[PDB]
Amino acid sequence: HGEKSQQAFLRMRTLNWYDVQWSKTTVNVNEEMVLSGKVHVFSAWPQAVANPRVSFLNAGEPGPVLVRTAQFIGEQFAPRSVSLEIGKDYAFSINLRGRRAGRWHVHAQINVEGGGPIIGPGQWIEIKGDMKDFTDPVTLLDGSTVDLEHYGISRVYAWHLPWMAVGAAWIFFWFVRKGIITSYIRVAEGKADDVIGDDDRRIGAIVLALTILATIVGYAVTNSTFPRTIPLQAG
Amino acid sequence: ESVVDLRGMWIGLVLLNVFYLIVRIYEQVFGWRAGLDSFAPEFQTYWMSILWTEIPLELVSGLGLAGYLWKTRDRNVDAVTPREEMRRLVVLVQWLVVYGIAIYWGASFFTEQDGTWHMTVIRDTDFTPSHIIEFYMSYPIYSVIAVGAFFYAKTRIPYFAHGYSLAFLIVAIGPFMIIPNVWMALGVFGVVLQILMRIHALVGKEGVKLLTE
Amino acid sequence: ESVVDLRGMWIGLVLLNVFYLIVRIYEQVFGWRAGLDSFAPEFQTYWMSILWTEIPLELVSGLGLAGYLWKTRDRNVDAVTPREEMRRLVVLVQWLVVYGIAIYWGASFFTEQDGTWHMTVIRDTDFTPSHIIEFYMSYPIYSVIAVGAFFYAKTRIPYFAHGYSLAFLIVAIGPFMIIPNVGWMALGVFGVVLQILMRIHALVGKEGVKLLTE
Amino acid sequence: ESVVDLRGMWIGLVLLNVFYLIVRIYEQVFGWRAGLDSFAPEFQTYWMSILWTEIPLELVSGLGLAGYLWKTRDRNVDAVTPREEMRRLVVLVQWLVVYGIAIYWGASFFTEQDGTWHMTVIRDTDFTPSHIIEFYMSYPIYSVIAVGAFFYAKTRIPYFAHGYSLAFLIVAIGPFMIIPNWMALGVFGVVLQILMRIHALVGKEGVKLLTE
Amino acid sequence: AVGPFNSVAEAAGCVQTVDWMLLVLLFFAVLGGYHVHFMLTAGDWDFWVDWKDRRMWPTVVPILGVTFCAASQAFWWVNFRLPFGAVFAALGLLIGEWINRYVNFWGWTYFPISLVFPSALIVPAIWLDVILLLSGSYVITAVVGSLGWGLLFYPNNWPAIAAFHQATEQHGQLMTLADLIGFHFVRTSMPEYIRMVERGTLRTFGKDVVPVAAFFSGFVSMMVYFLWWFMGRWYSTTKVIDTI
Amino acid sequence: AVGPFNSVAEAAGCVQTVDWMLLVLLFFAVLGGYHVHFMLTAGDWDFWVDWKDRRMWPTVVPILGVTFCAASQAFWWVNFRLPFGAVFAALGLLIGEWINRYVNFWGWTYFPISLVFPSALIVPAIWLDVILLLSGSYVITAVVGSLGWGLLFYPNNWPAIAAFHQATEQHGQLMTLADLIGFHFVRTSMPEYIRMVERGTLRTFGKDVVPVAAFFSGFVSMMVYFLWWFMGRWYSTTKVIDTI
Ligand SMILES: CCCCCCCCCCCCCCCCCC(=O)O[C@@H](COC(=O)CCCCCCCCCCCCCCC)COP(=O)(O)OC[C@H](O)CO
Ligand SMILES: CCCCCCCCCCCCCCCCCC(=O)O[C@@H](COC(=O)CCCCCCCCCCCCCCC)COP(=O)(O)OC[C@H](O)CO
Numbered sequence A: 001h002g003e004k005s006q007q008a009f010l011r012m013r014t015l016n017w018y019d020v021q022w023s024k025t026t027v028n029v030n031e032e033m034v035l036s037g038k039v040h041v042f043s044a045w046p047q048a049v050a051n052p053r054v055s056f057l058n059a060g061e062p063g064p065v066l067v068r069t070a071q072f073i074g075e076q077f078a079p080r081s082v083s084l085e086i087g088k089d090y091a092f093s094i095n096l097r098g099r100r101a102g103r104w105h106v107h108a109q110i111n112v113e114g115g116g117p118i119i120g121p122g123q124w125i126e127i128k129g130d131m132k133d134f135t136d137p138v139t140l141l142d143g144s145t146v147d148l149e150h151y152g153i154s155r156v157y158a159w160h161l162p163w164m165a166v167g168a169a170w171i172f173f174w175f176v177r178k179g180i181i182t183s184y185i186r187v188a189e190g191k192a193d194d195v196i197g198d199d200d201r202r203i204g205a206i207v208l209a210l211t212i213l214a215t216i217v218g219y220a221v222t223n224s225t226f227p228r229t230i231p232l233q234a235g
Numbered sequence B: 001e002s003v004v005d006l007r008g009m010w011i012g013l014v015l016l017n018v019f020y021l022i023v024r025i026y027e028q029v030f031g032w033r034a035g036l037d038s039f040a041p042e043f044q045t046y047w048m049s050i051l052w053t054e055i056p057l058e059l060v061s062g063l064g065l066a067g068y069l070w071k072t073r074d075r076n077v078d079a080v081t082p083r084e085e086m087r088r089l090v091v092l093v094q095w096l097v098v099y100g101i102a103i104y105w106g107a108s109f110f111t112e113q114d115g116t117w118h119m120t121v122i123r124d125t126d127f128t129p130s131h132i133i134e135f136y137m138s139y140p141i142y143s144v145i146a147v148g149a150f151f152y153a154k155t156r157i158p159y160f161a162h163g164y165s166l167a168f169l170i171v172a173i174g175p176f177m178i179i180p181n182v183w184m185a186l187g188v189f190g191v192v193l194q195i196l197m198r199i200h201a202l203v204g205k206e207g208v209k210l211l212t213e
Numbered sequence C: 001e002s003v004v005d006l007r008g009m010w011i012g013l014v015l016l017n018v019f020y021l022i023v024r025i026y027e028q029v030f031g032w033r034a035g036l037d038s039f040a041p042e043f044q045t046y047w048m049s050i051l052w053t054e055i056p057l058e059l060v061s062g063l064g065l066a067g068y069l070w071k072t073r074d075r076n077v078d079a080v081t082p083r084e085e086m087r088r089l090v091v092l093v094q095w096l097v098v099y100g101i102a103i104y105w106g107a108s109f110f111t112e113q114d115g116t117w118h119m120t121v122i123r124d125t126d127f128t129p130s131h132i133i134e135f136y137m138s139y140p141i142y143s144v145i146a147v148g149a150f151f152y153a154k155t156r157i158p159y160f161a162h163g164y165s166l167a168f169l170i171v172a173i174g175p176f177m178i179i180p181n182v183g184w185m186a187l188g189v190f191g192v193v194l195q196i197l198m199r200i201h202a203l204v205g206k207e208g209v210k211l212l213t214e
Numbered sequence D: 001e002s003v004v005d006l007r008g009m010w011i012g013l014v015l016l017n018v019f020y021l022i023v024r025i026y027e028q029v030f031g032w033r034a035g036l037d038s039f040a041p042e043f044q045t046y047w048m049s050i051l052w053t054e055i056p057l058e059l060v061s062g063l064g065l066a067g068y069l070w071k072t073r074d075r076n077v078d079a080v081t082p083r084e085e086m087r088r089l090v091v092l093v094q095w096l097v098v099y100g101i102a103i104y105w106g107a108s109f110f111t112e113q114d115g116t117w118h119m120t121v122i123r124d125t126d127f128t129p130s131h132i133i134e135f136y137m138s139y140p141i142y143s144v145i146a147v148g149a150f151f152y153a154k155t156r157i158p159y160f161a162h163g164y165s166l167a168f169l170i171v172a173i174g175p176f177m178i179i180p181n182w183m184a185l186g187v188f189g190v191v192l193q194i195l196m197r198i199h200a201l202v203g204k205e206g207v208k209l210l211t212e
Numbered sequence E, F: 001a002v003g004p005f006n007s008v009a010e011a012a013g014c015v016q017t018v019d020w021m022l023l024v025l026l027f028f029a030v031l032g033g034y035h036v037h038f039m040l041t042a043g044d045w046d047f048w049v050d051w052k053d054r055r056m057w058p059t060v061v062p063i064l065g066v067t068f069c070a071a072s073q074a075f076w077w078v079n080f081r082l083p084f085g086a087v088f089a090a091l092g093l094l095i096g097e098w099i100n101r102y103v104n105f106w107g108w109t110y111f112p113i114s115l116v117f118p119s120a121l122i123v124p125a126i127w128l129d130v131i132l133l134l135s136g137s138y139v140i141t142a143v144v145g146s147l148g149w150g151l152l153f154y155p156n157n158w159p160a161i162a163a164f165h166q167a168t169e170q171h172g173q174l175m176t177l178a179d180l181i182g183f184h185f186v187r188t189s190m191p192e193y194i195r196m197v198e199r200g201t202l203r204t205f206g207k208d209v210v211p212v213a214a215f216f217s218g219f220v221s222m223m224v225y226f227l228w229w230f231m232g233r234w235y236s237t238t239k240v241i242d243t244i
């Protein structure tokens, strides 16, 4: 929606948008739609904006009200950054799938690396349904399906919360077994060794052994589930 | 009488958590549909109203809290007795507890929140909903409270009354240099050591070495 | 006799403002037509003459002024009386007033002047007219004077006679590190006047002090 | 008895120069044809054997040297007599001499050597022959010695027994921050500390008079 | 009677409630300070599943992380001999992030928690804290403490991350789940090119990307720890000055 | 008689001439140092009417401007409670520049004064000095003093600058009088590309160019003020050392 505030001359002399089109203007949660169109890379590209040698096609939209399912520009599937030549035209399209019920204003968007967002035409797109109902899903290479809306989130919590709880336990442990004030005082008076002697060190030595162990284990296990993973695909 | 009262803390904690809860809840409501087009007149009525309100109102609360505490300053501060000092230190820790919570909201919650609103707009201005709350509300608020706590100690505690605690100076003025990049104020480390020194002294050789061991 | 003389100051101020006035006027004349082609033989006779003259002449003035002031140093400086010290401080303030003016010419006038000569040439060398004046004259000049002030105080005032005033040290050696960029600042005069002001305060009795000036 | 022994230094100097000579001679031999393909099995048998040997072996020598010297520490160190102190100082200088040689090999010889090996490979890993010797051998070795000399001082010389000489701390811990990319010319302050003690242990007579 | 306390109950009762108020107020406090610092520098790799790469992330995070863990230890340990400096700071951060990811990224803007979960620090923090307990030295902690801190980052995170590194084919291209999540749930201002994740080089030799970055973060964290330990000291200053 | 002065006339007369000598000697002095520093950094935008843009100039000048004002205050105010440090500095600079622009840029090389007139600092200098006078504090000056200094920079310049922002059409193009002045009066080494003035961006939103720049300079001047205040102090050192 920002476009109005953007500098007039930069908006005219960069991307020139034509034939923009919205498959639909109303859609149910889970129902697809395509935003599509063409764009002309102005031949006298302004100094202020880096060469569009590194750019990215996007759905100008207030968060994931519609999930992008695929997109294409210059006749390629474009999940990563693309080059636009100055002077040429490109055609693009973005497959959106409804997620959040409401009346959203959905734009075609391209960001240039040196320069920032360039906002194309947008259109109101009503979405009907209840986000509870929204799913993906998505097929892994091993053939199985997963719903991305929820996939993995349990395992995250299962790892994070126990650790935060362990973290809290340890803080509370020391804060109780020794005071803040008592400890300050003891240290300030001279001892110091009244606050910490082994077997406070025994307790630490054991908690650390338990921690390392729990780390090795949790590593190995997650290695058995999921024994074939790839690095993020970038470039 | 009572060394530990706490009613003032509770008042502040309740009056703060509650206020922010309203604010957060409100931004859920007028964030979506109200705070997306900053050129629409609904932006003026739901977001720019807050900006125009809070800034003058915060600047008055700041100087207000300021003057008031200088005026009611203890004019004979060195005369303060061990029980009355011990009470005042505990009111100072109260002020600081409220400071902590204001720092939590301003520096954690509404700060990292702006991170997610940036992924939800392309921005018509720098007065977005999140910036209005973050830079111009939550930040000034914890800044006011920092000054409060500083002047309390300045005007009620002899240690703080003559000279300036450097840690506390940094804590209260630090804030006005957080507006660049958008140093850190862990200066509370030194202020609680300063409070802990007084406590150590005000407890007798008996309370100390003997009682708490 | 006379605590405040000033003739020395006047002498220096006159002998300076006049000299630079000549130089500025001369560069108006031999700037245009004489100082535009550094490969012409008119450049040698009007501009490179100056460079070859001033440097050896400045290095001799500098060591000259130095040695002379060490030699005529008060060998029994702690004995100096309150009236004789008060005189010597006033001579030191004189030295500094001249230093101020030499700094004005070197560091403002001929320095920002080079800014405009750069928009008037594409440069055959780094010995242009302006660089000849700026780096190799106006700068060494104020540098010599800083050394002079420093040595006057060192050899006439007991405060400055044992130990080294840090602010003065920076003031007199600062200069030799202004030659980097291009390619710190010597506001160390701040501490020097405060050191002078301390002496004044003490030499005025409890009477002149608290009472008279109030 | 004897204030200057020196047999300990010789032992160390001989045992080091010799060892490194072997190492250098060895890398002449197995550098060419053995250490050019890190994916060949000859690399495992002639270069990765050393890496796997030296690291555990260095870590044990380091803690060994440490513990031993703490255990044989002088438990009544202030009682030490001027002739006994003088002797221990001269042993400390011996430790430091060895330190200097181990610094020479580690930070001069095998460090600038790697500069030339980089011009002779395009590298299958960061465990090249030169890196194996440089980072994982010569460096840990002079690091072990630094610690030795530090503990010797700590456990035999009163001045070093109480408090920590800053210079010596920096000298002995410095090493473990050479692995990033400051420099440890902290030996300056340690020899001045040694020189102060020598000054004091020589009487007003030895001093002002005898050496003049 | 133990003046300025009327009774022994009034004494120990007061101590006990000021103990709570300190713990709490210091707990955040450092969290506010830690979060803003971290969020400003280490970003960004912490917000987004599709930046949690093998090179940049296990490098900038341990190094930018250790800062307030070091300062916080300088505080708890020196003054109170309390061995929870690192965990005090790390936990503070984790909570302030989690609250936010949950209440705001998700509750407000509807990004899935699989997009926006934080990095895991508690395990490295424990190592840091126990090394300071066992050895009693910040020099040792600076060395072995901060080395373990860096090594343990990626392993203590793996369990949370591995699920998203499963492979999927989309329109003829390989993608990770993590890439796809990124891609599906549209961010207005996150073009793929901005990422700052590993993209390959003619000097990677392996297979070695993670353990090199792990050790790199470990060694660099030693310097940052030193510098932040001593800043913890400066911040703990009780110097009173005389004017402004 | 008031030794070491013979009379009350000789006392008061000597005091009165040394007062003049100090003022003057310190007046320039700080001018020489202020000018060189400023000239080397803030250049350059100060020399040329066609650099006096809406973004760079009202940023770099306030920020680089406040330095010697802060130091000059640290000296005049601490030791003499005299409230003119900023104005002492800002006026010295202006005089040293004006003399030069006139005697040299124009007098020597014949650039019109409209090309080469300096930036106006005296208003912001005053605001800075009075905030130090009213509050007695460098901390408050540092904050609200340097913020006003920032904000007032463009306004106190506008009167001098507006003439040249009148539009003209040359050969089918729009130009300001300021561009055209630079264009007409040929500088050997000043290619239009070298400028460093605002040329637009996809993130300007407004209409807001000058106000954001003014505030940005304001906020950044606070930090510089602090730093330069304390350096004013360092330079005011009366320490005597013992060897070289
Ligand atoms: C050289 C300076 C001169 C310039 C003049 C300007 C002055 C600048 C700023 C001065 C501010 C100093 C604040 C310190 C004094 C605190 C006094 C007070 O109001 O607190 C009460 C109690 O304090 C509390 O318990 C505080 C608990 C923590 C909460 C306090 C702040 C709550 C803020 C809540 C959030 C609302 C948001 C406001 C900000 C926008 C009173 O305690 P008492 O001990 O003085 O006396 C009690 C009785 O009268 C005697 O029987
Ligand atoms: C002068 C350049 C160097 C010349 C080359 C070597 C020859 C050295 C010549 C040394 C003469 C310099 C003046 C030093 C004489 C005494 C210091 C003096 O200047 O103060 C006197 C009067 O006060 C003055 O007016 C101070 C000088 C004012 C500052 C002006 C500096 C000189 C200006 C130089 C301009 C050079 C550039 C000209 C253009 C090319 C009073 O002298 P006294 O109080 O030290 O006597 C006590 C002594 O113990 C007895 O022997």
Ligand SMILES: CCCCCCCCCCCCCCCCCC(=O)O[C@@H](COC(=O)CCCCCCCCCCCCCCC)COP(=O)(O)OC[C@H](O)CO
Binding pocket: D007, D008, D009, D011, D012, D013, D015, D016, D019, D061, D064, D065, D068, D069, D088, D091, D094, D095, D098, D141, D148, D152, D156
């Ligand atoms: C079946 C075989 C099992 C092998 C078991 C061995 C395992 C190794 C464990 C490591 C134990 C460490 C032992 C090191 C002892 C050092 C001795 C000492 O500190 O120095 C003495 C001598 O010190 C010297 O001067 C030595 C200076 C040079 C140091 C050289 C260090 C070794 C150099 C080699 C480095 C390693 C590389 C070699 C090649 C492999 C002086 O001692 P003192 O003055 O306190 O004693 C009093 C004296 O007895 C009566 O007056």
Ligand SMILES: CCCCCCCCCCCCCCCCCC(=O)O[C@@H](COC(=O)CCCCCCCCCCCCCCC)COP(=O)(O)OC[C@H](O)CO
Binding pocket: D058, D059, D060, D062, D063, D066, D067, D070, D140, D143, D144, D147, D154, D160, D161, D162, D163, D164, D172, D173, D176, E139, E140, E143
């Ligand atoms: C895979 C990577 C490996 C990295 C491993 C590196 C480990 C080295 C860590 C760097 C710190 C070394 C220097 C530490 C300072 C000396 C410690 C000390 O002060 O000695 C104490 C003695 O206790 C001991 O430490 C006994 C020695 C055994 C412990 C070993 C710790 C030193 C590390 C040496 C291992 C080197 C391994 C190198 C191989 C790569 C003193 O006891 P005290 O305080 O009671 O005495 C009072 C004092 O005189 C007055 O204050």
Ligand SMILES: [Cu+2]
Binding pocket: A001, A002, A105, A106, A107, A122
């Ligand atoms: Cu829109």
Ligand SMILES: [Cu+2]
Binding pocket: B114, B115, B118, B131
């Ligand atoms: Cu923001």
Ligand SMILES: [Cu+2]
Binding pocket: C114, C118, C131
């Ligand atoms: Cu030049």
Ligand SMILES: [Cu+2]
Binding pocket: D114, D131
């Ligand atoms: Cu190498």
